[PDB]
Each structure stands twice: as C-alpha cells, then as structure tokens.
Amino acid sequence: SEQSLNGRWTLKFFPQPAVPVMTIEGAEAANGIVVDAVVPGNVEIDMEAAGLVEDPMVGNNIYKLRPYEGYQWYYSRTFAAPVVTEGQRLVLHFGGIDTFAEVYVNGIKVGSADNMLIEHDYDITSVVKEGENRLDVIIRSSVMEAQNHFLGTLSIGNFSNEESAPVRRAPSTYGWDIMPRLVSAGLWRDVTLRVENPVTIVDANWVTLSVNPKAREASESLYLQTRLPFEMHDKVKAVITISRDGRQILRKEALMRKFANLFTLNLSGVDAWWPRGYGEPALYTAEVSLVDVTSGKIYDTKTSKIGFRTVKLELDEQFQFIINGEPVFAKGTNWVPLDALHSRDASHVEEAVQLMVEMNCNIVRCWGGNVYEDTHFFELCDKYGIMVWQDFAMGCGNYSQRDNFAAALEKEAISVVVKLRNHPSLILWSGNNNDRVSRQVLSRVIYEFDPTRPYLPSSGYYKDPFYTENPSQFVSEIGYHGCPNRETLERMFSPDSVNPWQNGVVGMWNDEWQTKANRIYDDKFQGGRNDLMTNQVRIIFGEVPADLDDFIFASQSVQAEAMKFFVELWRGRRPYRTGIIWWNIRDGWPLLSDAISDYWGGKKQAFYYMQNVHHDVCCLINPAANGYMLKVDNNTLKDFEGVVEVKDVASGKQVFKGKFVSKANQMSEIATLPMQKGQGMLVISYRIEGNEYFNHYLYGEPPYKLDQYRKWVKKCGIYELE
Amino acid sequence: SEQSLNGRWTLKFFPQPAVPVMTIEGAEAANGIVVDAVVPGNVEIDMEAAGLVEDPMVGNNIYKLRPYEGYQWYYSRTFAAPVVTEGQRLVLHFGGIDTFAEVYVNGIKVGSADNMLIEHDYDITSVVKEGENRLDVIIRSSVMEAQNHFLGTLSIGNFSNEESAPVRRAPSTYGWDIMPRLVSAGLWRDVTLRVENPVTIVDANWVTLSVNPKAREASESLYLQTRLPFEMHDKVKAVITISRDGRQILRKEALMRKFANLFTLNLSGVDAWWPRGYGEPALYTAEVSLVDVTSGKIYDTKTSKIGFRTVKLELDEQFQFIINGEPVFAKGTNWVPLDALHSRDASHVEEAVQLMVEMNCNIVRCWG
C-alpha cells in the first residue's frame, strides 16, 4: 500500500542568518512566524492564505515577495508509520523539494536534498518508531546558496541569472522576459509513504525494438530490474501482460532466476503509435508483476500505457524526424512554465495540453528554463499524439566544467531519463547549449540509459528576408508580441493603469505595464521590451492607436498575421522545410508577452489564426510577385480530395473555384491566382469529407489601414473581433 | 585593514622520522635545533645567518645542503587577533608554503598545504582567541613525499627529477642543467592577516571586449563576484572608476541586486596597450568599490592597472601573435628562476626586468 503524506503541514519561516539553520533544535529555537501550509504547495500560497502577502499577479506586487528569497522554511508534520513485516522496506518519497534542505525522521537525518527538479527517496525502515513519527524538513535560501561557488567567466553576464548557474533549479524562477522573478520554495509535489516487499520491482524499461504498422506487428523489449532475495530465486515468476481496453493480447510468464532480465515480446495484432495526423496514438496497457510460484502472492506490480513506435533523427548532409520509418513534418509550440508557483502546475496541465490539442500540434518542446513536467503531462501527450522534445534544465548561459557540477547533473540526468524513457511521446533529449555538460555528461547518460532516443547537444516585418530567406529546414524558436485581451488587462492591472499610456502620451508605458513586460527587478525605466509592441504595430498599420481597444486589436492582428505567415511559409515550402516550433502557446504568469494565450486562458487572436493553418490538410497561399500561389499541405499518411474556393473580400469577386487532390505527407500546388490590385484580403473556403474549413490571405504591402483590415476580418466571416 | 604576519618567526628543524610529524605535541617533543627565522624566507638563509651552513653559491658547498632534504621544519609565531564585528571574516593568507605542511591556529588545524606554487587562504574567524594567538606550521620533507606515489613509466628517466613528478613544486628546485639542486623549504612569500566585511569583493575580472586604437575607444567588461548578505541586496552599489594619472575618465554606479554581475564599459578617449616598439604601454587605473547606498560606507575596494588590448594566436595553415589586429614580431628571452632560494626572487624582480627593458624585449616566456 501507499500512504499519502499530503495535506496540512506546519510551516515556520524566518530570515536566514549568517550560519544557515541545519538542525531541528536550531529551527525550533529561531525566532520565526508559524502558518498552516498545504503540501503540495508553495510558501507564498500559504502566506497569501494567511493575509501576509498580496496577490503577486496584480500590479507591481511581484516585487513585494523580494525579502522572502533570504528566508528559511521549516516544514514539519506527524505521520503514522505502518507496521512492516520482516524483510519489507519503508520508503519516504518526495516528488519535489525546493530546494536545499535537511530531512529528519524522529530527530534523525535521513538525507540532504539539493535538486528542485528530481524526486528524492529515502529508506526510513530503521529510524521509524511505533505509532506517530515526526517528519521535519529545514529548507534554506536558494539565492544564498549561489555564494558557496566561484563562477566561471562565461557563467556571468548571461540572460539566465548568475544565481542559477551553480544550483539545480529551474532557471526561469530567478526571472526571465516571459516569466516573473519568484524563486519561492516548498514541497511542491507529492509526499508519500511506500511499503515495499523484499521482492519488488526496481525499474521496468519498455523499449520498442521494431514496428511493422501495416502488418500490425511489433517487437517490444522489457528491461526489468528487481530486488530479489536469494532465497526467492527460482521461486518468483514475472507475469507480463499486454492489453487494450481490457482485452488481453499477450501474456508471458517466466521464472525469475536473476534480479535483472530482458524479455522480448513479439506482438501481433497491435497498432503502432503515431503523432497527430499521421495516424492514431495507439496505446496499450503494459503490466509486469512478480508472483510467487507456490502461494501465488503478488509481491509488486508496475502498470503503464506504452506505444509501439520507432524514432530516428536524420541529420541532413537541418534535420527531419522519422517516426515508424516515415518522415513527419513537426508543427508545435514551446512549453514554458505553467505557473511561477510551480506547485500549481499539476492543476493547469490538463487544460494547457488541450490548448495544443485544439491547435493540432504534433510536437512540443519543453523549454530548458522550466522544470521537468511530471508523469501526468507525458501520459496526456501519449494519448493525444503530441511528440515531446525535452531539453535538459539549463538556460541561456554556459555552465561549469568542474566535477561537482557534472556529478550533480549526472545524478539529475539519470533520474529524469529513467522516469520518462517509457513514454512513446518522448522522442528527443537536448542539451539546449568542448562543453563537458553537453558533449560528455548528458551524452554519456543517454548512451547508457536510453540508446533508443536521439540526443542533440544544442538546438520587424515578418516578410523581411531575415525570416523569409532563413535557410534552416527546422526552425526551433520564433515569436511576435501580442497585447492580451482587455479582460486580462483589467484583471492584472490597477484600474488607473489598465490604459498603457502614461499621461495619455502614446508610446510611454506606465510603471505597471513596464512590470509585466517582464521587468525582473524593480528598476524604473522607460521603453525596453514593451516597445516591441508599438514598433511592430507601427510597421504594419502605420501609426499606434491611442484607443486601448484599437491598440489591442492592432497588436493582436500583427501577432496573428506574423505567426500565420511563418507557418504557411514553412508548410508551403515542403519538402525542403521539415518542421516548425513556434513560441509560444501559453503564458505561465499574468504578463504582456509573445504567447498566443494568457495564464487565465484568454486566447489572443493569433490562436485562432494559427489554428486554421495547423489542420492535417490545409489550403493556404504563399506570396509571389506573380501573384498568389494556392497550395494544400498534408501532414497525414492518407490522400484527401476536396473543393476549394477563393474570393476577394472587399469586392466579393470569385478568384478561383475547383477541386484538388492532396497527396499524403506532401505539399501539392492547386493553382496560381491572378494578382489583385492594392491591398485586400482573400477568403479561402474548402470542404473535405463533409467538413468545412476556412483560411485567408492578406495581399498588398504594409502599411495597412487598421479600420480597413478590421472590416475585411469581420466580412471574411471566420474570426470575431471580440 | 590588513595586518602583516611577516617578520621574526621561530624555526625548529630535525630529521624526519619514518612516521612524519603531523601534530604540535609531536613537533615540540621531537629532538631538534631552534633558530630565529625571517619570513618570508628560506630555511637555508636562516641557517647561514646562524653560521650553521656555508655559502652554497661558492665552490662545491651546494652539495653540503644535501642532508637537509630529509628534515622537517617547524614554524611558529604569535600574533594579535584584531577585534572582529559580527558578520566579518578573519582570513589567514599564505603567499608561499614550501611545501607539504599542517597549519594550526590555537592548537586547532585550519588546513593542510600541498602546493608550493599557489596561495593558501584559511578562515580562522571561529578558532581565534582574544589577544595573542599561536600560529604553527609543521612542514615535512618534500623529497620523501614522492615515495607516497607509484610513478608511471614515462614519468621515470626524464630530465626532470622523478621526485618532481607527483608533487606540485617547481621542477628546477630538484636540479637542472641551469639551476642547482636546492629543494629547500619555508614560508617564501608574504603571510598576512585580513579582515573582510560581510560585503566583500571575491573577484574582479577585467576583460577587453574590443579596442579601436585609432578611434581611442575601447569596450571593457567587468565580471564581478562579491559576497553579499541577502539583507544587503538592493542596498549596496558598485562604484566603478577608470582613471589615468588621477584624471577621471569614466565612473559607473549600479545597484547590487545579485552577488555576481557583468558591467560593460564603453570607453572613449582611452589609449590601447601595446608591446614595446608597436606603441605605448598605456595603462589605466581600474577601481571597483562596494558602497552602502544609505550610509555611504565603503565595504571593499579592488584596484589595479588594466590595459585595453586584444590577443589572437594565428596558427599558420608556425604561428604569429596578433595584438590589437596587428601582427607583431616577438623578440625576447626565456624567464628562468631568479634564485634557487625562491624567497629572494622578489628582491631581484625589478633589476631583472630592467635587463629585458635594456634588451628591448617585447615578449618573455616564463619557463615551466
């Protein structure tokens, strides 16, 4: 059984002195404040519930959490230890400790945590009592831990904070241009008590050796590691079961004559796992149990949903992902922190993944500035067919080449790889970077613990040749600023600061708008990152509107047209272009950013534009001095037939009407359209297998008139001005 | 302030037994000879002042220092510890310990030195007393330390001594064709006591990003690392000053919101640093201070003379040095030990550098 230690804990906080508190008698003796804390949680959530801090999402209140970065946090609770039989093991499991802390059980230290991003398991079998036991965790300041290290030259001056270089925490917690500075602390993931038998499963590594999708065959390997007392050798059998919706497909039983074994399962009548568009995300329940051959008692059982899929990164001799022997075109978003207070991430995962399902992304890149997402995130990507590109947790910056950092990074890499290597959605590991970390440490971990996935050591006007003539087949990062919806503006800003213009002077941002750009520290300055919004609006629409609703529509339209153009340009230049990962789909804080949706679920206009150019089959138009090139792109393994009609919005004249055949996994040209005069919009209507789809193309050259573009969008009949 | 622990010490020497002396009760109990030693110094300088050895520079007297390679050397003195305020740090600094030694303060070990060539700093804030404190350094034989290692094949038979392979000492001290065999030992560089504030400068790394000599412009970077208590974040400012002969050229102040920062200085009206012949060795005084924004109290200050210069080694495709975008022709000498008793090196540096100035060398290679 598994007993949960989540719930109400006791939290005592106080400023950290020159000598950090490491013991219990020191934590109880320190003059501090005591509050009721919820675990999993962040300490700022507990303090806001106590009325001690104000909502950091509103105004400049984010800077008011500054003093608590030098505090210590004393967690303490009491649990009932279950009765253990002789030979069993009692494990205390922490899913998330932020970050540097000493763990005590019954006044005895059981471990010292030093990594925010990985789990920490402790054996407390010999230190527990009978009845109620006391658990104590004394966390110290993450910021002050940086001064225990001497930084290398290239670790200073990067965009990532110097405080983030020598420690193993999410880099964006120290502040970024898309995430606030909120280091925080606390037990931000589950804390559980586990009772393990003498015979228990240490790890079950499922690996697809081969997959024959057209034959509905697959060869799956199970690298099983167990704890097996020698008196249990030749007396325990491993029971392997592959099932789908309850129906049993294969059952293999084998006697456990050694603690580690490889079982190869040659399956038939099983479907392959495919990313979105290229097929179904077929998942099968894989269960392994350790059963006594005499009494039949089950000692342990591991269950998960696995997918039969092969992954190969073909480096062009600038790459292309090969899934099940087929070259897929990757279209997706970068994944940023779901929340600055990362204990709330698990409450956003389901709804945020749905943003990618609605977008019809087939790939997602987990940004190295974020924590590693939990298992439930990958379980969702498994069943929705979203491939996962995982960067290791290092941000814009170079890191130490010494042995201490390598050992800490090796311990972290092995932990996260073992935790995630069995998800079919996971397809790539990246160093996000001569470097020991990217070309030796991380590559050596992938070499030993996951040889079946590739490892990569490193990663104005939207029609400007900088974007157009970029020779990369696979773009990994690309984004344009977009002002959030009015409702999100009124919620995060003070009433007198909702309008951005200080004194009404167009272009000069007030202090609260400068905070939500994002200004990491509270320095009073004018301009900076927010000027990107007015600059991009001034280019496309000539002048920056003074009215807020006009400025919202203008800024969201610039982001919408720019983002839609990049996707249509990459999908339209196949088969040379092999993939596009844009930045980004969702904000992790109430902020002014280049994401296409906010922290509160407010979808910007770019989200709807991007959604209509991410379909499995998409009719689009690419620019040409000869006029318009009507194309259709197919990101599936099937051919589709439809009828497409293009008419001019301002005149109502029909420019083209005819049927098309979209060949599988390729771009097909439909027709070349006559060049229209001046500026305007073409509406693209096409029907495929009884379903209506819609797209558009804005012709002409900037500067455009804002009021004219708005009429064209409303008459196009696709997007609401809202 | 910085209190110097140089001057007269107590030196006790005796043959090292099979078990090397590591403690104080062992050093005081050993049958040895006691002499007045000058620090910085070499033990042979102290013994020659005592008439115990003859001048090793004359005749074959260099071989008469042979038996002392298997001796131990017990340094000991008494210092007055300054009164420290709450939060400050008392640092004991050794510029040169030759070589393998145990450092004690008030009968408590604070470190074990094992490198003749680098400094050794110790935090003695928690072990000092009030008034007079006792400092003890028990050095053992550098030669006998080699037998604690098993040498690889290509470490044996070289021109450098096999005794020099596993230890971190100057190889020529064991003998060369241009330097005598005189291993020696002792505190051959300064020994000082430092009082550091809670807010102090750990390192100030000045780096020339670019230099435009004809435009008299330069882009200098300052990679600054400090010790900053969190209650001092947003309350200390870094004051950067570039000056020449007193005249101020640039002054930049920035609030210290984190312990490590990069400050880029785009300078104008500054001259580039050139090697001899190719121009003037223009130097500028670079000063960084950590100042309280309220009281104005200065917590620490680092000062040095920096030169705006770029360096690139062009490997011919057999190389050429490129200084400030210009290919320089290097002409100079190799730099060998200034003295077998390396505590006297600092007394020869000024006069020996003048030999290269008179020679008009633009380069010097410091021999390994």
- Name the residue among A285, A277, A279 with its Cα closest to residue A303: A285
B205 interaction partners in chain A (CB closer than 8 Å) = 153
Beta-carbon pairs below 8 A across chains A and B: 49
- Name the residue among A593, A565, A592, A595 with its Cα closest to residue A580: A565
**Contact check, Cβ <8 Å, A70/B207:** no
Closest by Cβ to A163, choosing from B223, B258, B262: B258
CA angle at A561 for the pair A558 and A564, rounded to the nearest 5° = 140
Q: Is A564:A479 a contact under the CB 8 Å cutoff? A: no
DSSP3 helix / strand / coil % (chain A, rounded to 5): 25, 35, 40
Name the closest residue on chain B to residue A158, using Cα atoms.
B262
Closest by Cβ to A162, choosing from B227, B255, B259: B259
The backbone torsions φ and ψ at residue A204, rounded to the nearest 5 degrees and listed phi first, read -125, 105
Q: How far apart are CA A426 and CA B215, in angstroms?
A: 54
- Rounded to the nearest angstrom, the minimum Cα separation between A165 and chain B is 11
Hey, how many other C-beta atoms are within 10 angstroms of the C-beta on A215? 10
Q: How far apart are CA A491 and CA B90, in angstroms?
A: 53
Q: How far apart are CA A219 and CA A208, in angstroms?
A: 6
Partner B, chain A 518-557, Cβ-Cβ below 8 Å: 521, 523
Name the closest residue on chain B to residue A174, using Cα atoms.
B258
Closest by Cβ to A157, choosing from B228, B229, B262: B262
Tokens standing for A575? 């088969």
**Contact check, Cβ <8 Å, B230/A70:** yes
Tokens standing for A150? 């001497």
Partner B, chain A 145-204, Cβ-Cβ below 8 Å: 146-147, 150-151, 153, 156-157, 161-163
- Name the residue among A381, A386, A384 with its Cα closest to residue A363: A386
Buried b (16+ CB within 10 A) or exposed e, B64-99: ebeebbebbbbbbbebebeeeeeeebbbbbbbbbbb
Partner B, chain A 57-116, Cβ-Cβ below 8 Å: 66, 69-70
- Cα torsion angle, A394, A399, A404, A407, sign: positive
Buried b (16+ CB within 10 A) or exposed e, A146-174: bbebebbeebbbbebbbbbbbbbbbbbbb
Q: Which residues pair with A111 in a beta bridge?
A: A103
- Rounded to the nearest angstrom, the minimum Cα separation between A19 and chain B is 10
What DSSP letter does each residue of A295-360 carry, written as one string? T--EEEEEEEEE----EEEEE---EEEEETTEE--EEEEEE--S-SSGGGHHHHHHHHHHHHHHHT
- Rounded to the nearest angstrom, the minimum Cα separation between B199 and chain A is 12
What does each C-alpha distance from A54 to A58, A282, A553 come to in angstroms?
A: 9, 47, 31
Tokens standing for B236? 């200390």
Name the closest residue on chain A to residue B255, using Cα atoms.
A523
- Rounded to the nearest angstrom, the minimum Cα separation between B84 and chain A is 15
**Contact check, Cβ <8 Å, A147/B234:** no
Tell which phi-psi region holds residue A584, choosing left (phi > 0), alpha (psi between -120 and 50) or beta: beta
- Name the residue among A385, A380, A381 with its Cα closest to residue A276: A385
**Contact check, Cβ <8 Å, A153/B203:** no
**Contact check, Cβ <8 Å, B231/A16:** no
Q: How far apart are CA A501 and CA A489, in angstroms?
A: 13
Hey, how many other C-beta atoms are within 10 angstroms of the C-beta on A563? 26
Closest by Cβ to A521, choosing from B202, B228, B257: B257
Q: Which residues pair with B205 in a beta bridge?
A: B223
Q: How far apart are CA B179 and CA B173, in angstroms?
A: 7
Q: How many residues does chain B have?
A: 368
Q: Is A58:A600 a contact under the CB 8 Å cutoff? A: no
Q: Which residues pair with A509 in a beta bridge?
A: A501
Give helix A548-572 / helix A706-716 axis angle, nearest 10°.
Answer: 60
B225 interaction partners in chain A (CB closer than 8 Å) = 150-151, 156
The backbone torsions φ and ψ at residue A211, rounded to the nearest 5 degrees and listed phi first, read -145, 125
Q: Which residue has the tokens 């708008």?
A: A513
User: Resolution in angstroms, to 1 decimal, for this deposition?
Assistant: 2.5
- Name the residue among A285, A241, A288 with its Cα closest to residue A261: A288
A143 touching B (Cβ < 8 Å): yes
Q: How far apart are CA A567 and CA A573, in angstroms?
A: 10
Tokens standing for A515? 């905070």
Tell which phi-psi region holds residue A601, choosing left (phi > 0), alpha (psi between -120 and 50) or beta: left
Residue type, B276: R
- Rounded to the nearest angstrom, the minimum Cα separation between B268 and chain A is 22
Tokens standing for A18? 């020159």
A113, containing H or E segment: strand A108-113
B255 interaction partners in chain A (CB closer than 8 Å) = 523
Q: Which residues pair with A645 in a beta bridge?
A: A657, A685
How many angstroms from the chain centroid is the CA of residue A90? Answer: 33
Q: Which residues pair with B186 in a beta bridge?
A: B98
**Contact check, Cβ <8 Å, B257/A144:** no
**Contact check, Cβ <8 Å, B223/A157:** yes
**Contact check, Cβ <8 Å, A157/B221:** yes
Residue type, B117: L
**Contact check, Cβ <8 Å, A66/B258:** no
Q: How far apart are CA B359 and CA B103, in angstroms?
A: 43
Residues whose CB falls within 8 Å of the CB of residue A410, separated by 6 or more in sequence, listed in order = A441, A444, A445
- Name the residue among A67, A121, A112 with its Cα closest to residue A91: A121
Q: How far apart are CA A362 and CA A388, in angstroms?
A: 9
Tokens standing for A500? 């951005």
Look up residue A670 and give its DSSP letter. E
A157 interaction partners in chain B (CB closer than 8 Å) = 221, 223, 261-262
